[PDB]
Design a binder for this molecule. Structure first.
Ligand SMILES: *CCC(=O)Nc1ccc(-c2ncnc3ccccc23)cc1
Ligand SMILES: *CCC(=O)Nc1ccc(-c2ncnc3ccccc23)cc1
Lengths: 277, 276
């Protein structure tokens, strides 16, 4: 679909200046912006295009970065590294993110995830979720877990292998409820067995391919199986999934896993809530 | 404009095989097709009938299904349930979707929607699913929608409304009342958590009494969506524009996304954007 959105180094480097400023200032002034920068027209155009936004408080007077701002910054960066040249449609919305089809010059198609923390908040937080995920995805990919191949990331943006499948949110019928139900329960366990309970395990965490085999997608800060309340969490993850199947597919099974089943094989909680080796 | 081509079960099994193989392989060699089924001539004929398409690239060498191929598979499957016996004339080119008149044995008429998105076979399979369930839900919540009848693959069968699409209507007795019927509907959707997303003159059918039925269940995004408003305001604009054009009607009784009294969690039940 869409090729890189032309804009001058002057727009760009200023935008970046606004990036750098927010670092040490909530609401950043043109003076600094301009200092860093090497202008005021650029600013008008940026505020025009809605790449930035300006606020006077009780005490402060200057400019912020809008998500559109950040979005670009990210894509420009990624464009540099060859990863993405072209951006298709928003496929959908995730827990607190946006997912688009993207591709590189060479024609290969990937998924771009764009973190948006602010269901109710900073761009910062979204940068750090992107991090945690990229790392989490690699751990789980190398260990032969069923997740996309994490490819690159920058800022709040995460490129990973595209999957031939629809998200479970939009699956309204399946011929083998037990099969998928089990592939899911079998995944929860494989996780715990490396020390990991997800915490917010819902339909949004699963893709189904054309052959109806599963893949995991949303990886926030997880909980360690040595967490005080590890169980409760485990309990929830399972409980949720059970409900969705019972509600969507009307599939129920008294075969739901329990904490006992967990037989630690790994220390994958090498960064997770209550690691305390 | 009645029954189409008769075919050998072999022809079908092969067609089925191509399908089966496209799950794991985009282009599928005879090897599998054969193995999947139990021959090569069959293929040649399907190619000839433009039912399938063979292709050779890089190192890849095998067959794929044509839209038409898919069409037949479906109809056959539909035949085998008495749900579709005969096929009337294509009614509209009015989306990435081809819509037809059809009838069963007893001769009752329904409308067949065939999804034409553009892998493509798959996403189209799943459009249909979404559409069915969505449409089912709305029907059951007493909305003005075609009663869904069945679906298979990229194909959805549903009640055939007795009236003409708004895009082919050049005058109405009381435009206002229609406009307000339309505006209501938009609202009532939002109130159960929904936004049609393609609400336009193509997706609204005026009946004998000038009462409105909705037909495209696509994005049908949730009101909890990031752009829930923009969608909303878009849908409204279509209507306004349409009447200040076809009918030269202009009212100031717009609905606003501000006016929205969530009464149901339909967005949730059917998952079309949305939250816990
Ligand atoms: C439950 C709905 C949801 O979260 N939406 C959604 C939309 C698209 C995808 C998706 N589809 C194909 N390939 C993907 C690769 C990587 C990440 C997400 C992908 C998932 C979920
Ligand atoms: C504006 C008209 C247009 O885009 N096309 C069009 C063609 C047919 C129909 C239609 N008419 C009667 N019953 C139907 C049932 C189901 C689907 C479509 C139907 C509407 C719009």
């Amino acid at each position: 679909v869409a090729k890189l959105r032309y804009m001058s180094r002057d727009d760009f480097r200023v935008l970046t200046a606004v990036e750098m400023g927010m670092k040490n200032h909530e609401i950043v002034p043109g003076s600094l912006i301009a200092s860093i920068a090497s202008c005021n027209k650029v600013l008008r155009e940026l505020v025009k295009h809605k790449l930035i936004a300006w606020e006077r408080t009780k005490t402060v007077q200057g400019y912020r970065l809008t998500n559109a701002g950040y979005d670009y910054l990210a894509l420009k960066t990624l464009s540099s590294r060859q990863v993405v040249e072209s951006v298709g449609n928003q496929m959908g919305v995730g827990k607190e993110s946006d997912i688009y089809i993207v591709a590189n010059e060479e024609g290969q198609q990937f998924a771009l995830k764009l973190h948006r923390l602010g269901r109710t908040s900073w761009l910062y937080l979204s940068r750090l979720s992107a991090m945690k995920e990229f790392a989490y995805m690699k751990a789980l990919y190398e260990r032969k877990f069923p997740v996309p191949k994490p490819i690159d990331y920058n800022r709040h943006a995460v490129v990973m292998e595209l999957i031939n499948g629809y998200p479970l949110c939009q699956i309204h019928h399946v011929e083998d409820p037990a099969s998928v139900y089990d592939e899911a329960m079998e995944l929860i366990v494989k996780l715990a067995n490396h020390g990991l309970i997800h915490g917010d395990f819902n339909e949004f965490n699963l893709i189904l391919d054309e052959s109806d085999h599963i893949t995991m997608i949303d990886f926030p800060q997880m909980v360690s199986t040595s967490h005080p309340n590890a169980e409760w969490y485990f309990d929830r993850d399972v409980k949720c999934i059970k409900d969705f199947f019972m509600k969507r597919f009307s599939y129920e099974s008294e075969l739901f896993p329990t904490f006992k089943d967990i037989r630690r094989e790994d220390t994958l909680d090498v960064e997770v809530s209550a690691s305390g080796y």
